[PDB]
Amino acid sequence: SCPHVALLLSSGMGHLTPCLRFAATLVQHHCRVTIITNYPTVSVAESRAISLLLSDFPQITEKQFHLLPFDPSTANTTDPFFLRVEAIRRSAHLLNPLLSSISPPLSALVIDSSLFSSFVPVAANLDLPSYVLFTSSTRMCSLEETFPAFVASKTNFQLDDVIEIPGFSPVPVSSVPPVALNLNHLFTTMLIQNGQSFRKANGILINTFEALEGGILPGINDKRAADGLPPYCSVGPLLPCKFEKTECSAPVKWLDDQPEGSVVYVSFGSHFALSSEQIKELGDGLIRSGCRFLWVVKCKKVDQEDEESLDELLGRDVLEKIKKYGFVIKNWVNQQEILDHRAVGGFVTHGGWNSSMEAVWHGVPMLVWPQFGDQKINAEVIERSGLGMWVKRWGWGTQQLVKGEEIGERIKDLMGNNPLRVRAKTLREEARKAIEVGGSSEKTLKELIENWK
Amino acid sequence: SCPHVALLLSSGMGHLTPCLRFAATLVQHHCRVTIITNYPTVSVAESRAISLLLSDFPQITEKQFHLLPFDPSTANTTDPFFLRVEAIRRSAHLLNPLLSSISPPLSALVIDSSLFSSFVPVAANLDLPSYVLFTSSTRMCSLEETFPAFVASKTNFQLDDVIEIPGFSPVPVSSVPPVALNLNHLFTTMLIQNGQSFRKANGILINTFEALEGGILPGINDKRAADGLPPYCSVGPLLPCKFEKTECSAPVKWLDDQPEGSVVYVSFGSHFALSSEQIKELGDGLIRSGCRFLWVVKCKKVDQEDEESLDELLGRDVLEKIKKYGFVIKNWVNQQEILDHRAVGGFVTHGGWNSSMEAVWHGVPMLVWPQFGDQKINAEVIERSGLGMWVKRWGWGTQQLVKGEEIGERIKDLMGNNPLRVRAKTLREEARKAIEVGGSSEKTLKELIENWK
Numbered sequence: 001s002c003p004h005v006a007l008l009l010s011s012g013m014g015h016l017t018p019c020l021r022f023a024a025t026l027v028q029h030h031c032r033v034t035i036i037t038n039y040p041t042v043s044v045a046e047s048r049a050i051s052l053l054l055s056d057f058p059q060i061t062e063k064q065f066h067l068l069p070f071d072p073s074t075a076n077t078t079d080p081f082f083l084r085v086e087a088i089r090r091s092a093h094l095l096n097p098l099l100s101s102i103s104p105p106l107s108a109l110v111i112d113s114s115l116f117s118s119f120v121p122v123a124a125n126l127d128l129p130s131y132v133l134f135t136s137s138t139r140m141c142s143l144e145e146t147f148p149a150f151v152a153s154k155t156n157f158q159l160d161d162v163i164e165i166p167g168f169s170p171v172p173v174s175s176v177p178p179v180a181l182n183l184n185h186l187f188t189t190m191l192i193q194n195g196q197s198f199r200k201a202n203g204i205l206i207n208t209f210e211a212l213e214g215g216i217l218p219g220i221n222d223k224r225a226a227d228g229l230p231p232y233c234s235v236g237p238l239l240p241c242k243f244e245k246t247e248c249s250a251p252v253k254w255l256d257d258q259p260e261g262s263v264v265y266v267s268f269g270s271h272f273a274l275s276s277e278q279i280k281e282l283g284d285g286l287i288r289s290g291c292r293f294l295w296v297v298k299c300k301k302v303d304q305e306d307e308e309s310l311d312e313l314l315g316r317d318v319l320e321k322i323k324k325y326g327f328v329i330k331n332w333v334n335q336q337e338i339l340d341h342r343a344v345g346g347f348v349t350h351g352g353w354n355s356s357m358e359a360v361w362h363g364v365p366m367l368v369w370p371q372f373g374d375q376k377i378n379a380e381v382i383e384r385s386g387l388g389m390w391v392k393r394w395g396w397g398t399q400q401l402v403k404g405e406e407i408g409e410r411i412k413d414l415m416g417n418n419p420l421r422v423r424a425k426t427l428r429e430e431a432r433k434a435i436e437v438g439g440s441s442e443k444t445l446k447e448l449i450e451n452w453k
Numbered sequence: 454s455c456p457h458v459a460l461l462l463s464s465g466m467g468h469l470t471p472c473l474r475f476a477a478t479l480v481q482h483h484c485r486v487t488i489i490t491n492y493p494t495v496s497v498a499e500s501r502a503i504s505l506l507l508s509d510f511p512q513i514t515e516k517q518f519h520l521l522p523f524d525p526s527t528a529n530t531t532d533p534f535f536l537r538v539e540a541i542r543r544s545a546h547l548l549n550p551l552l553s554s555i556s557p558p559l560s561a562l563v564i565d566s567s568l569f570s571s572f573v574p575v576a577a578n579l580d581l582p583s584y585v586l587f588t589s590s591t592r593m594c595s596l597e598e599t600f601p602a603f604v605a606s607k608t609n610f611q612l613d614d615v616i617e618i619p620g621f622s623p624v625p626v627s628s629v630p631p632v633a634l635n636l637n638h639l640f641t642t643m644l645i646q647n648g649q650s651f652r653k654a655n656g657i658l659i660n661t662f663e664a665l666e667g668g669i670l671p672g673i674n675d676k677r678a679a680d681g682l683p684p685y686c687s688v689g690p691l692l693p694c695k696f697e698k699t700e701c702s703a704p705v706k707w708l709d710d711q712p713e714g715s716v717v718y719v720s721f722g723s724h725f726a727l728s729s730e731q732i733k734e735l736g737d738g739l740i741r742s743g744c745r746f747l748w749v750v751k752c753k754k755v756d757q758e759d760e761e762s763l764d765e766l767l768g769r770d771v772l773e774k775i776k777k778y779g780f781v782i783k784n785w786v787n788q789q790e791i792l793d794h795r796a797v798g799g800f801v802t803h804g805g806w807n808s809s810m811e812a813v814w815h816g817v818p819m820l821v822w823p824q825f826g827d828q829k830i831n832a833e834v835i836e837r838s839g840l841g842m843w844v845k846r847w848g849w850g851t852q853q854l855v856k857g858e859e860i861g862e863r864i865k866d867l868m869g870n871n872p873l874r875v876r877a878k879t880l881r882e883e884a885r886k887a888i889e890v891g892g893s894s895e896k897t898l899k900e901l902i903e904n905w906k
C-alpha cells in the first residue's frame with residue numbers, strides 16, 4: 001500500500017524548488033510520485049533541477065503537461081514567469097485527460113498555489129484530494145486568504161492602514177506586495193482568485209514547523225475547523241535533496257580557506273536582479289563593512305538572458321578592486337551547501353521563504369533586505385523568531401536606494417549580533433527535531449499519508 | 454501496492470556491497486526495503502557504506518539484529534570475517550521476534566549466501582519466500598551446491614582431478630578455495646551447509662547478466678525446474694549507488710591529468726592483504742612495466758588495524774622511489790569511480806566478483822591474479838568472457854610468490870591486449886542492455902516483484 005501522489009508545477013524557481021524537495025520527501029516516506037511538468041521552462045535552472053531529480057530518483061514519473069498556444073498580447077505584465085503561470089492556467093481543461101491516463105490511480109493531487117484557482121476544479125471533478133503547495137510563509141498565506149475580502153470591503157484603492165489577519169499580527173499595506181496595489185495587474189487578480197480558492201482545498205501545505213511560528217498553529221487549526229476551513233499542514237523545513245550537495249565547487253573551495261563565522265553571504269534569490277547603482281553601492285558597502293563576503297550577482301531577471309559582465313556593469317577596475325576583499329560571482333551557486341558551510345556567519349537576503357528556511361535549517365543569522373512581493377511579510381516572521389533583523393528604513397529594494405555607508409555599517413552590526421546566533425542554534429535544533437520521528441512535520445506528514453492511506 | 458522486502462546481512466565488504474546496491478535498486482523499483490544490520494562491523498567501510506545508504510535513502514528502514522555473546526575460543530579460525538558470520542549464525546533463533554515486529558508485513562526475506570543454512574528455517578516457520586543473495590559467480594554457486602556431494606563421495610581427502618559442474622565447465626581442485634581442502638575448517642563447514650540449503654529457497658539472486666555467461670543460463674534454469682530446484686535469478690549488473698561517485702576525490706584528480714587508457718589499476722579487494730615480499734616484488738613490477746598506475750595497498754586484513762605505513766614495510770627510499778612512477782595509496786578508495794575514469798586502461802585484480810562486475814560494467818580489461826577463495830573460478834569465468842586474462846603459472850597468491858619481472862612483463866601484455874578492449878566495449882554494452890527495459894535482468898527483477906505481488 002504505497003499511495004500515489006501527483007504534483008502540479010507552474011514556473012519560477014521560487015515555486016519549483018520546494019516542489020521537488022517535497023516530492024523527494026514523499027518518495028522518502030513510502031509514496032509513489034508523479035510530477036506534471038511543462039516545457040519549455042522560463043529558466044534553465046528549472047530544467048536542470050528536474051533532470052537532476054529524475055536522475056537521482058528514477059522511481060519518480062514525469063508527465064509533460066502540453067499547454068495551449070499562448071498569446072502574450074493580452075497579459076498586462078512582461079514578467080515571463082507570471083506569463084508562463086498564466087499560460088498554464090488558461091489550459092486547465094487540458095490537465096484533466098492527462099490526469100486520467102496516470103496509472104496506478106492517484107490518491108492526492110498537490111497543486112502549486114499560483115495555479116490553484118484554475119486547477120482546483122480539475123481535481124474536484126476527478127474526486128481527488130487536492131492540496132495547496134504554498135511556497136511562502138504562513139502569515140503570507142493568511143494574507144492571501146484575507147486579501148480578497150479586503151479589496152471587496154473597499155470602494156477603490158488607501159493610506160497605510162491595517163488589514164486584519166486572523167491568528168497573526170496585522171499587516172500594514174506597506175508590507176503588502178507593491179504590484180498588488182493596482183487591481184488590474186495579472187499577479188493581483190491571480191493572487192485574489194487563488195486566495196479565494198484555497199478554502200476549496202483539503203489541506204494547505206506550508207514549508208514550516210510549529211516552533212518557528214511561535215506555537216500559534218494548533219490553535220489556529222481547530223479555530224479553522226470550526227469555520228470549515230482547510231488545516232495548515234506544517235511539513236517543513238523541507239530538506240534539500242541529495243544532489244544539491246556538490247562538495248567540490250569553486251565557492252566552497254574558497255569558503256574552506258576562511259575562518260568560521262567571518263564570511264557574509266549575499267544572494268537575492270534567482271528571480272530578482274538589482275539595479276546598476278544599487279549594485280555599485282552594494283559593492284562599496286561590502287568593502288566598507290570590513291568583513292569577508294560571498295556575493296552572488298544578477299543583472300537580468302531570467303538567467304537565460306543575463307550575459308553581460310560586471311566589467312560592463314561596475315567596470316573593470318572596480319570589480320578588480322572588490323574581488324580582493326572577498327568572492328564575487330555572477331553565476332548559479334548552491335545556497336544550501338554554502339549556508340551549511342562553517343565559514344558563513346550571516347546572510348544578506350531578499351527575504352524569499354526558500355532562502356530564509358534554508359538559513360533557518362543551517363542556523364545562519366539573516367539581514368533581511370526586501371525587494372518585492374511577500375518578502376516584507378517574511379521579514380517580520382523571521383524577525384519575530386529572533387534569527388534575523390531587517391532595516392525598515394530601507395523599505396522596498398525596488399523602490400528605494402541604499403548607499404554603501406549604511407550597508408557596511410549595518411553588516412558590521414550583523415556580524416556582531418550574538419543573540420541572533422544564540423537563537424540560530426536553538427532554532428536549527430528545533431527545526432531538526434521537527435522533522436525527526438515524533439516531530440511536528442513528521443506527525444503532520446504521517447497523518448497526511450495515513451489518510452491516503 | 455509496494456512489496457515490503459527485507460534483507461539480512463553478514464560480515465565482509467564483498468558481501469555487504471551487493472546487499473546494499475540491490476536494496477537500492479529495489480527501492481528504485483517501488484519496493485519497501487528494510488535492512489537488518491549487526492554491529493559492530495569488522496571493517497569500518499561497512500559501517501560507512503551502510504550510513505551512506507541510509508543517508509541517501511531515508512525510506513530504507515534499518516533493523517539492528519542484536520547477536521548473542523560470542524566465544525571465539527571454540528572456532529578454528531582467526532579470520533575476523535568468518536568469526537563474525539559465525540557469531541551471527543549462532544544467534545539464528547532470535548531473528549524470529551525481530552522479524553515479527555516488522556511493520557508493514559513482509560513480502561520476502563533476502564538472505565546472504567553465507568547465512569542461509571542457519572536462517573532459512575526461520576522464514577519457513579513464518580511462511581516467507583526466502584531468497585539467496587549470492588555475491589559470487591553463477592558457476593561458483595553451482596560449485597557450492599555440488600561440493601557437499603563431492604566431499605560425501607570421498608572416503609578421505611585427493612589429487613588434482615575435477616569436480617563436475619552441471620551446465621558449466623568442470624572445476625579442478627586447483628581452482629577450489631584452498632581452505633576448503635581441509636574439512637574441519639569453519640568456513641568449509643559453512644560452505645558445505647550453505648550450498649546444501651540453497652535448494653530450499655524460492656530463488657537464487659545472482660549479480661550477473663545472461664549475455665555474460667554465454668547465454669547458457671535458461672537451459673540450466675529449465676533443467677533446474679525439472680529437478681525441483683529454485684531458479685538462478687540473474688539481476689545484474691547491480692548498479693553502483695549515487696554516493697559511490699565523489700567527483701572530487703584525491704586520486705580522481707590525479708587520473709584527470711593522465712592520458713586515457715594508460716593507467717593500470719591494481720587492487721585486491723578489501724578483505725585481503727598481500728605479503729611483504731610480494732608487495733615489494735609488486736612495487737618492483739609496477740615500475741618495471743613502463744605504465745602509469747594507481748596502486749591501492751593493504752598491509753593488514755581489517756582496515757581498522759592497518760595503521761602502519763609503507764615506509765615501515767617497503768622503506769622510505771623505496772616508496773619515495775615508487776611514488777615517482779605511479780600513484781601509491783594505503784587507504785580506502787572509490788573503485789567504481791576509478792574504473793569509470795577515462796584514464797584507466799586495465800585492472801590488476803584478485804578475482805573478487807564485485808570488482809570483476811564493476812570492471813565489466815565500466816568495460817575495463819582485467820589481469821586476474823587469484824589470491825584465495827573463489828577467485829580462480831571467477832578467473833576462468835572472466836577469461837572465457839573475453840574481457841580479462843589470468844596466468845595459471847602464478848597459481849594462488851597466498852601460495853606462490855610472483856617476482857617483479859613477470860609481473861611487469863605480464864602487465865605490459867595486459868595493456869597491449871586489443872581483443873580484451875573490443876570485447877570490453879561489446880560486453881559493457883551487453884551489460885547495459887540487460888538492465889534497460891526489456892533486458893534480461895529487467896524482465897527477471899520485474900518478474901520477481903510481480904510474484905510478491
Ligand SMILES: O=c1ccn([C@@H]2O[C@H](COP(=O)(O)OP(=O)(O)O)[C@@H](O)[C@H]2O)c(=O)[nH]1
Pocket residue numbers: 013014015017267268269270271272296331332333334335336351352353354355356358
Ligand atoms: O544563486 C543562487 C540563487 C538562488 N538559489 C536558490 O534559489 C532559491 C531562492 O528562492 P526564493 O523563493 O527564496 O527567492 P525568489 O528568487 O524566488 O524570489 C533558494 O532555495 C536557493 O537555493 C541558488 O541556489 N543559487
Ligand SMILES: O=c1ccn([C@@H]2O[C@H](COP(=O)(O)OP(=O)(O)O)[C@@H](O)[C@H]2O)c(=O)[nH]1
Pocket residue numbers: 465466467468470720721722723724725749784785786787788789804805806807808809811
Ligand atoms: O580500496 C578499495 C578496496 C575495495 N573497494 C570495494 O570493495 C569491493 C571489492 O569486493 P570483492 O568481493 O570483489 O573482493 P573481496 O570481498 O574479496 O575483498 C569493490 O566493490 C570495491 O568497490 C573499494 O571501494 N576500495
